[PDB]
Amino acid sequence: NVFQTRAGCLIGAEHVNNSYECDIPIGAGICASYQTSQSIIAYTMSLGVENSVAYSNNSIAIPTNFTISVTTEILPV
Amino acid sequence: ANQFNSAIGKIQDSLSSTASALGKLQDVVNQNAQALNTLVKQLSSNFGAISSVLNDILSRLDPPEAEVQIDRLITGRLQSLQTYVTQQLIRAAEIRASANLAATKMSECVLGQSKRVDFCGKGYHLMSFPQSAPHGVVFLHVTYVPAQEKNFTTAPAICHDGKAHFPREGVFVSNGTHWFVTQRNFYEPQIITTDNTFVSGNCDVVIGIVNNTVYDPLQPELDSFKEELDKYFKNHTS
Amino acid sequence: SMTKTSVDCTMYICGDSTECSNLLLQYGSFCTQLNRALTGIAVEQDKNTQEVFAQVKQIYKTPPIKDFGGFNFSQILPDPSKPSKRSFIEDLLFNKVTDLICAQKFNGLTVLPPLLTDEMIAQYTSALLAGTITSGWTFGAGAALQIPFAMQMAYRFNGIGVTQNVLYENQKLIANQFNSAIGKIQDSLSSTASALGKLQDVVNQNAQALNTLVKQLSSNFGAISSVLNDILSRLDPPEAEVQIDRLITGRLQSLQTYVTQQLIRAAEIRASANLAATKMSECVLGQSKRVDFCGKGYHLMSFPQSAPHGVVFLHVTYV
């Protein structure tokens, strides 16, 4: 469990090549998360699910359905 | 009705199960709590002197040696209190900045309708519900978001008599056979008419224009009544 | 964002001194308040990148077959042939913004690396560029909706009061005006390197603050000598505690002055980050009708660009 990066030597964590959504940040693009017989793993942060929208001259997408979403924002005063 | 009532019910389930959503307000109380605790703990430090109790310094050391030792705590506790005031002035600029940002959301999102993008929250803003919170305010934002979509075939213009026709409101769509005019935010198929489009330019100045037949709502009404005019004057000549 | 710095009270004031370490315990928790203040700054500086650079949670890409209607986006779009993802405009943005770091780390000043690296910043920018070119204003307020780019400017003109018939007739004229305007950006950034001085001043204020913080250690502050080995190895233990106390009091005020100065600059960088984050949603993601907000003229579309310790906005307006 010895791994080095730009943030320095990190002991007690396993290196994973896959990229998921983590919790405990580290730095220099390397993060940390508790995942599966479970331990702490360190891996490069994931940038989100890749969605490639098709583009064409005559192609257009008009939504046929809608939804009503309610969000909560807490601003201190 | 089922979309709004179910969304409000999820608020009670989110606030009860997750207590960290209000952490924005808990950080204000915890910040002032750590500032008051540290400010008191500085009273027990000697500050390079013999003792931290000024009553013991006066009751033991001589008057000439006491004024030097007592001055060490007075100077130290003064700098420790200036540090507290300095932190409070800095934290005041943070809480007043969030208050000015909240005062703007009360006017634009709640009182009126704000067309700003992602100011009232993600999606197209509709109506905002203010709520009371300790040392703060909670905002409930009702927004309009699309759900499902379908790929359509569009055209920049419709060519009929040789003059280009452009949509007044909405965009052109097609299922592969008929060309319809629908809104961008919602799909409402409508027959292309002279009332929904306007004539500008010609067909040669538009790149990608397609040929179609623009239905004139005045055409069949006048023609059917024109046949009443032809048959009437037919009796005039008979 | 600004450079993340961390300063320890023990090594900065008096290092390798056991007697001075006990004298520091007499002044209480002052280390805790100075360490948590500098730590809180490094956390808020990372939050500025999450509220500005990070906007949409989905990664958008450009189609292989590109017909934009005469526009050339190769300047704003990143170059896949390079080992790191960046565009032609971001080439001049990074090169015109200016070891000193290693020398400051020798005196006990720790420079923490940022959580969000430079490679991920350009990906967030490329995701917002590829989305605006394709999905237009749809992906910001909801699910991504594919729309022809020629139909996108038609709605952007109808929002400012211009009938879309102007676009189809002037499409050849607008193609030359836009491509020539983007070409002036590369000529302005290469010839004039002072347009980015707003970001260079942020680095200069940090360089002057870190260097002056170290230069205060060479001053004696009214004591016998600034070197710890000079006082401890000469004067008696009762006499040395008085002279070292003069070094502690002086170096503590110089350290509290730096922390107080950085907390003030931390409030200034968050004010500009909130102003930049507001332009991300209104000018870039959507279309803002505000006057002199997205820039002079009637706003149409905004193209964000990655920059070191900042962000560059490219606004397209109707004049």
Numbering used by the authors:
A (entry chain B): 641 to 676, 689 to 729
B (entry chain B): 924 to 1161
C (entry chain D): 730 to 827, 848 to 1068
Give the original sentences from the paper that presented this experimental model:
The spike (S) glycoprotein of SARS-CoV-2 mediates receptor recognition and viral entry into cells. It forms homotrimers protruding from the virus surface and, once engaged with the host-cell receptor–human ACE2, undergoes a substantial structural rearrangement to fuse the viral membrane with the host-cell membrane. The S protein is also the primary target of the humoral immune response during infection. A large number of SARS-CoV-2 neutralizing monoclonal antibodies bind S protein, especially its receptor-binding domain (RBD), providing a basis for vaccine development.
We determined four cryo-EM maps of the Beta S trimer engaged with ACE2, including Beta S-ACE2-C1 (only RBD-1 up), S-ACE2-C2a (RBD-1 and RBD-2 up), S-ACE2-C2b (RBD-1 and RBD-3 up), and S-ACE2-C3 (all three RBDs up), at 4.0-, 3.7-, 3.6-, and 3.6-Å resolution, respectively. Overall, the pattern of these structures is similar to that observed in the Kappa S-ACE2 complex. In the S-ACE2-C2a, -C2b, and -C3 maps for both the Beta and the Kappa variants, the up RBD-2 or RBD-3 appear also to associate with ACE2 if we lower the map rendering threshold, indicating a dynamic on/off of ACE2 association with these RBDs, in line with our BLI data showing relatively rapid disassociation kinetics between ACE2 and the S trimers (koff = 1.00 × 10−2 s−1/9.34 × 10−3 s−1 for the Beta and Kappa S trimer, respectively). In contrast, for Kappa and Beta S-ACE2 complexes, they all present pronounced population shift, i.e., with only 14.1% or 8.3% population in the one RBD-up C1 state while the remaining dominant population existing in the more RBM exposed C2a/C2b and C3 states with two or three RBDs up and possibly engaged with more ACE2s. Transformation to the fusion-prone C2a/C2b and C3 states can lead to loss of concealment for the S2 central helixes, which was offered by the RBDs resting above them, and decrease in S1/S2 interaction, facilitating the shedding of S1 and transformation to the postfusion state.
